[PDB]
Design a protein around this nucleic acid. Structure first.
Ligand SMILES: Nc1nc2c(ncn2[C@H]2C[C@H](O)[C@@H](COP(=O)(O)NP(=O)(O)OP(=O)(O)O)O2)c(=O)[nH]1
Ligand SMILES: [Mn+2]
Length: 579
DNA sequence: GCGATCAGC
DNA sequence: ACGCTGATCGCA
């Protein structure tokens, strides 16, 4: 129903200097995944290419790598990483429909060409789920069905570039796509393909000690409970805690008693068993998610793990990391922090380098709110986390422990993002009247922040959306909702995403400037991970001293704000040691 | 599959 | 009744 050439070989007209390209990878995790077919649409027509002959054709391979041959794609990082696993480099991607739809509206959840095409009333293409199926019935169709689907997806990309670029221009997002998101897409592909070396023997050893330590706490729980039960079962746990031991019921779920960590901690004065349960869950958390889960996805031949950074998922412009999630590796507890010791450099005599912003969101907030006191505080390079901990616990700076500072961290972010006196009272275990007075004192010291949070909520009502400094956008229709609860959640989003999203923009530009700087200096250093406000690199030890002056300055100079940006940096033999 | 729960930023 | 996530697992 759409004409296309089911090609046997590669011809010259398939190698035009502009084309829409589809390199289809159906596997969810595209690392070392098969490429099932290729489609090319250009000024000379539409073509389908079997990959086993196109990826062996030297003319087609050189065309993929020629950055002067411009390609329009959807989810180009997926194709670039899958081609890297084939030994092939993809260059010249000038338009990515996935990232263009993500900037226009992150709430659409665009996951295939059809979903993005529907935004511009283009429907001459079927959803991937309709072609490949779901679950156990998911399979690659036969060639005449697969070929048309890929050709129709390429033809859609061919027709949709101009309408998407036009709306991006109106939204002041054209530079956000071409100079930020798309260059970052190539960087993340290099990071994902590089992987991170893992000391599997160190993990496997911890897994044996965790299993023997779990049983010790397990029997102490059975002894404290008086009987044996399924500690992971909410039904039996609720019966042991709130029926047999008759502990107070502080919170309910839709299904029964709540046993979250905040509940168990308030029950600590009532029985010893709740703290053993907390320690029991924490050991099981490390065992299930970070010992077993990490060893399951590690590449045995290289001892490397290859995460996937989802660039078009979060509503604020952050990244996310899946299978494995390398953005939530434990650190706050010392027994769980040891897992970062298993993340090691990929070569001998290389080291791990980690740099991170100091309170980037609060400094971003100070610049945007133009609050005199908050700006002055960061011009003094004050640690607002420590200062707030001093005011809360009524101590001096030398008396503030890292545990108190982490609590003040939630107070600083909580207050600026709309926490209530009720919520602050429950987080600090203080009276609700003390919380309201403390929030009152917090806003009289920073009246520009309170002014900004009121103005940004009102601007979201008038425009219907909020923006970040680099013009990333998030629509908030619920901010005019007739329901109080629904509207209140939307109001806190209006307070948060311009600040969290602007911090995501800044580090995204920092990664782009860093790689150009590294290439300029002809260094072997390269990025490994991004953890929201942290950059983790590996490099030969001979490059560490150059990086101590290069990486912080690049990150601090990504943008220029009314307050400076401060970057902390450490290096060591493991990720654990890089702090 | 969903939701409670928990690891991170 | 601060925000943004992903993985695990019992199933009330
Ligand atoms: N709304 C909210 N955002 C948070 C929270 N925690 C972290 N974020 C988000 C906000 C920011 O985007 C980032 C800050 O996380 P860190 O690096 O752990 N703390 P910082 O860098 O300020 O101080 P230092 O590094 O010296 O310890 O993660 C929170 O409790 N609430
Ligand atoms: Mn930080």
């Amino acid at each position: 129903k759409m004409a296309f050439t089911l090609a046997d070989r590669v011809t010259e007209e398939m190698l035009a200097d502009k084309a829409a390209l589809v390199v289809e990878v159906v596997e969810e995790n595209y690392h070392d995944a098969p490429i099932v077919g290729i489609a090319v649409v250009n000024e000379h027509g539409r073509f389908f290419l079997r990959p086993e002959t196109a990826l062996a054709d030297p003319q087609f391979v050189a065309w993929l790598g020629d950055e002067t041959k411009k390609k329009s794609m959807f989810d180009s990082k997926r194709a670039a990483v899958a081609l890297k696993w084939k030994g092939i480099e993809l260059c010249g991607v000038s338009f990515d429909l996935l990232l263009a739809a993500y900037l226009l509206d992150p709430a659409q959840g665009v996951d295939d060409v059809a979903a993005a095409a529907k935004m511009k009333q283009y429907e001459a293409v079927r959803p991937d789920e309709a072609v490949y199926g779901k679950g156990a019935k998911r399979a690659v169709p036969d060639e005449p069905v697969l070929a048309e689907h890929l050709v129709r997806k390429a033809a859609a990309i061919w027709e949709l570039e101009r309408p998407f670029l036009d709306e991006l221009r109106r939204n002041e997002q054209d530079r956000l796509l071409v100079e930020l998101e798309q260059p970052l897409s190539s960087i993340l592909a290099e990071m994902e393909f590089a992987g991170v070396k893992v000391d599997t023997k160190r993990l496997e050893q911890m897994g044996k000690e965790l299993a023997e330590q779990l049983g010790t706490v397990e029997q102490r729980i059975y002894e404290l409970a008086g009987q044996e039960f399924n500690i992971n079962s909410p039904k039996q746990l609720g019966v042991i805690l709130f029926e047999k031991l008759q502990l107070p019921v502080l919170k309910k779920t839709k299904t029964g008693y709540s046993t979250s960590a905040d509940v168990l901690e308030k029950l600590a004065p009532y029985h010893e068993i709740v703290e053993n349960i907390l320690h029991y869950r924490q050991l099981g958390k490390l065992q299930s998610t970070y010992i077993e889960g990490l060893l399951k996805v590690v590449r045995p031949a290289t001892k490397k793990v290859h995460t996937i950074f989802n660039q078009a998922l979060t509503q604020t412009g952050r990244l996310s990391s899946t299978e494995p999630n390398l953005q939530n590796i434990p650190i706050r507890l010392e027994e769980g922090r040891k897992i970062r010791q298993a993340f090691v450099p990929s070569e001998s005599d290389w080291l791990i380098f980690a740099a991170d912003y100091s309170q980037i969101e609060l400094r971003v907030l100070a610049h945007i709110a133009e609050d005199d006191n908050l700006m002055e505080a960061f011009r003094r390079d004050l640690d607002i986390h420590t200062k707030t901990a001093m005011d809360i616990f009524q101590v001096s700076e030398d008396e503030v422990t890292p545990n108190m500072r982490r609590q003040a961290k939630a107070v600083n972010y909580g207050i600026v993002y709309g926490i209530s006196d009720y919520g602050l009272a429950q987080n600090l275990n203080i009276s609700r009247k003390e919380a309201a007075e403390f929030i009152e004192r917090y806003f009289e010291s920073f009246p520009g922040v309170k002014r900004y949070m009121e103005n940004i909520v009102q601007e979201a009502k008038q425009k219907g959306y909020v923006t970040t400094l680099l013009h990333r956008r998030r629509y908030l229709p619920d901010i005019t909702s007739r329901n109080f609860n629904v509207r209140s959640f939307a109001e806190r989003m209006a307070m948060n995403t311009p600040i969290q999203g602007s911090a995501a923009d800044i580090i995204k530009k920092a990664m782009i400037d860093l790689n150009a700087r590294l290439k300029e200096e002809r260094l072997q250093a390269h990025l490994l991970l991004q953890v929201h406000d942290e950059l983790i690199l590996e490099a030969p030890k001979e490059e560490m001293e150059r990086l101590c002056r290069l990486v912080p300055e690049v990150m601090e100079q990504a943008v220029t704000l009314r307050v400076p940006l401060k970057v902390d940096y450490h290096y060591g033999s493991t990720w654990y040691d890089a702090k």
